[model samples]
Target: NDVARGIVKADVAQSSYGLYGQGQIVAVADTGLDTGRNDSSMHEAFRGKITALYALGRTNNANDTNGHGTHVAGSVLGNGSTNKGMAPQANLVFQSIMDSGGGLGGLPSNLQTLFSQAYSAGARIHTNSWGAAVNGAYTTDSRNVDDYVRKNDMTILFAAGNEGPNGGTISAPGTAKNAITVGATENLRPSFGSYADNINHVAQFSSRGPTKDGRIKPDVMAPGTFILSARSSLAPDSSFWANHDSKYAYMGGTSMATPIVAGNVAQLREHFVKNRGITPKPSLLKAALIAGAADIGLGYPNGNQGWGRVTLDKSLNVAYVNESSSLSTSQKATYSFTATAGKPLKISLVWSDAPASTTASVTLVNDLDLVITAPNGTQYVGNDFTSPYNDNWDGRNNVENVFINAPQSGTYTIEVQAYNVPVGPQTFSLAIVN
Candidate 1:
């Protein structure tokens, strides 16, 4: 029953560290929250965790007429009495990015406004499941996501569209350079159709990417299929299964996965506050999740799964993280660490890239590189997956990683070189674990 919880080890984190996203807040920019009814009744999953609510764009009805937003909100922070969320104790700032019909439409001209509104209301983790039908193409929507993330220094997530199993199928706004795009993975929800199907592979409909400008996307994966979440009593809540329950609903998509990552990020932020005594920037959150991602066996850093599936329990508890680091043209940042033979070491670099216009051919403006030198002088470059064991670097993407499954024992050097920063000095976050 807690398969998703077990897969990401949320149960472990909850029991061990008592982290229930205690004081963090997430923003849901989707349909609406538990406002599906006219009475005073509310979904059991969201008792008191909701901080504020509003309707953005055209609509003034801030309640959910469609079941989508409610489920998304529950996945982020359900109270767990009926069904558990990733960060059950975390608060949420609900923004209805829906039209008058109470569905997807009537959005603001500046998509960044959605996030900035949330930020103004004290939300640092903004999650959205809405995107256009366009695939692997950056649009004004994509630019806004990138812009707001840097403008407010917030963690934003988007669903990589369900138009996939094919390459270059990532949805429009998700193609943004900085937002953490998510894909769906099968969950072991027994008795649910396709829930346990191919547990080791990504959901066939979950989008894949090597975006138009050639960047590895979906940055991460999460269990999304047949997820049991809050049910809106008012809406039909379209779904493949003819299911019914008074307090819960079943759904799936990269949409579901996106909020899972958002909730985990809330937990990660809480971790930083309690353990590290400092708040983490969005870049640092991105790097830690990517650095601690679990390989799905397809390969370590391929386009199909980007870094891999996210597991906060293992996403760098004992890792090194540097936030908002900078690099000017041709500049480099270096550090050292000791590793043991046969042990694994992973280092990831991520930066919120400068927002690009739709006219720009390339999405990435500032290019940073990751390079690793073993005690024996062997160099493994960032995203140089030609061998995951060879030498090379990449420039087409804003995210980079160098993973060594079997490292040589001794001191190793880690460097972040500014390969090309046409946009001038760049800021970044670094995460490492062994």
Candidate 2:
């Protein structure tokens, strides 16, 4: 039931989006992959599906010794032979980044090497579920990781970490501006209610954010509690609920939440490619996922649930969605669309922002603004969260959103502008829900 619960929990199990990441490659950097290569569960699930394996730590083999990486990998692409993952048809590229001695034992070069190898091998999405196990430590690793998405057009999802119930607990790399950090919610199939009442409840241990710089750290939430997934054959004692057959186990954390989202990304990417034959930009994917998220009636955007729990059905199947072209410095991109009176109109603007200034509290390097000129000559500014209903906005540096619950009908002119760009020709992904 865990598999079914996860599928239904995401609200995508019954949707008509047919693609399941058939031709997409996802890269995972973790301890290593056992992949059940020696036995049943994973052997059949992953047979001929592992594109490549690289050893970035002490050993040259990618077989997992610690079991953490194996569990993570299975969650991303495990077949139902053991347990179903989010993207069973997606191919995998593995990099063993942990040493046999237990720590992340490798030269700093190891991290860079792993990323380069994955990019060269045609991986567009990378799932990372590990981070510095401390709070409020914004390291250079965050900036470096952000570079991969901005420069290479890869989508990366990092765990927001297990330290939670406190603000500003997001760890480095997860704190990266451009990277999509994920927080944990209680498992969807559980009976507990204290902190696991509904699918929208944030797990108590899921890291809370608003980084030291006041940026929302975790961009979304996913089920991470007591998730049952592929287990490594190396250790029977890896978990308290390990299956005797060495096929599966139950574990929970933002570590578990990260891959669930990564798999969803694969699904979304596949949907775009198969339906429209266009590979969505990382920013568009981000905007779609965030815009399509179920608000859970928690108002617009909250800290615990950045944009609310993501639903692939909403992201891919929502009505009135449009993709915009790249925008240059001081350039304006306009769209004329129709909306109904009293009906809500949601629009989001996202960009692969320039690498943040390491020293600033507000790290935005390029700024863009979203404005809507209603047919009534009423103008609404983006991120002006306190304005009247006709001009409601929710502004941020890299991402901007505007929600008009009672929109005026007619030809509404939606305009995006480069408000400020120290860097020239900044590109962005824009999506509208009418």
Candidate 3:
């Protein structure tokens, strides 16, 4: 956790800004939390942090029997004593999606119900570390997630799955257009086995994305290898490191990375509410983080590692942001900003578009365009990667980005046009940084 804390700059966030996700409440929908055996004793890390707990599906018992949920919980907010999670002080509302036998039988008919219940109990951030291995298909789960987040301003995250090394491998629900899908990067550690050499390398098992209909998924990356977190005493266990104690264990894959970022979201949310007196919308949260993400060795806007690994420190102060903007068919919204000549001008447009049917061939419902006009009147469109062009704007993704390395000093005009909004007016988030 220390290595990851440093890599994502959470160490600096904690040391300088006191951003330990103090008052934020995160919602975790996973196997079940480990409250120790018979629910007699709560883990020290989660003792006072759990706001509420509920057993979904057919089971009334809400306990971590499979161990996966406890591990995810640990990643989100485990106490730093034995294993400190990303957001150590963040509270949580846990929904156990496991049955009495610790199986998927407890899963509800609609995924939105779980989100609704969590929202009712006051959770602004939700994390899903598990998904069906259906390759990159955008299923009903994706639709449900997109549907919920578009209506609610809650930030939701999903693991891109461990299908790996292959293009178009991001799993469903993780394929949701609104939710921030996460990928796994290599972790730096000695007491654990790793898939790659260092933090710069993307994990071989971390699922890559063209996401079925070809939208850039895994919006960000993080240390997903050999992540040491809490372990459930009731579940069958395996410990890679020397600390084979009953309390902590090592879990890897995009699952581990998802909560790590989820914890960062909690931290950032707390910072926003406490310092700025603004409770950011989910789209704004995504745009702010995407705008601040540091570019790894891999190039930007690619399918493997979209935008690069998230940079939490820079995300805190994304220069200009618009979260409550909307437009209809053939309509456009514009914002102007001064540009830096030497620094790269990064602009990201994010929206929770209307969900598509699982059987639909194309996933995107509301198409938007990000067009940037430099001081010299030359236009730069979104997702052009190599260079800007008029006809080459990205059509597949709800998340559009425009990166200009060195721009002439002048006012840059940014536009978000509703190319096709079959579902009427669409609200979006826009973030700019230079």
Predictions in order: lDDT? 0.80, 0.73, 0.83
Which lDDT tens digits does candidate 1 get at residues 277-316? Answer: 8788888898889888888889955668888988777763
Model 3, residue 10: what's the lDDT? Answer: 87
lDDT, candidate 3, at 8: 88
Q: State the weakest 10-residue window (summed lDDT) of model 2.
A: 5-14
* Candidate 3 TM-score versus the reference: 0.94
lDDT of 2: 0.73
Kindly give the stretch of ten consecutive residues in candidate 1 with the minimal lDDT sum.
235-244
lDDT of 1 at 37: 37
Q: Show pairs that collide, candidate 1.
A: none
Error of 2 at 399 (Å): 1.5
Q: Write the per-residue lDDT of candidate 3 for residues 1-434, one digit (tens) a residue.
A: 65788888888888989999988899998888875333448776787677888877445667787788888888889884776888998998988887756566666778888888899999999999988877789988899999999898889999998988989888878999999999988778844654635888898988988888888888999888877788876767542333446788777789889999999999888888898788888988899889888777888677788778878888887765556677899999988989879988888888888989998899999899999898999897888877545568777899888878787898999999999999979988887777
- Give the TM-score comparing model 1 with the true structure, all chains together: 0.95
Model 1: CA > 4 A from native: 36-40, 240-244, 388-391
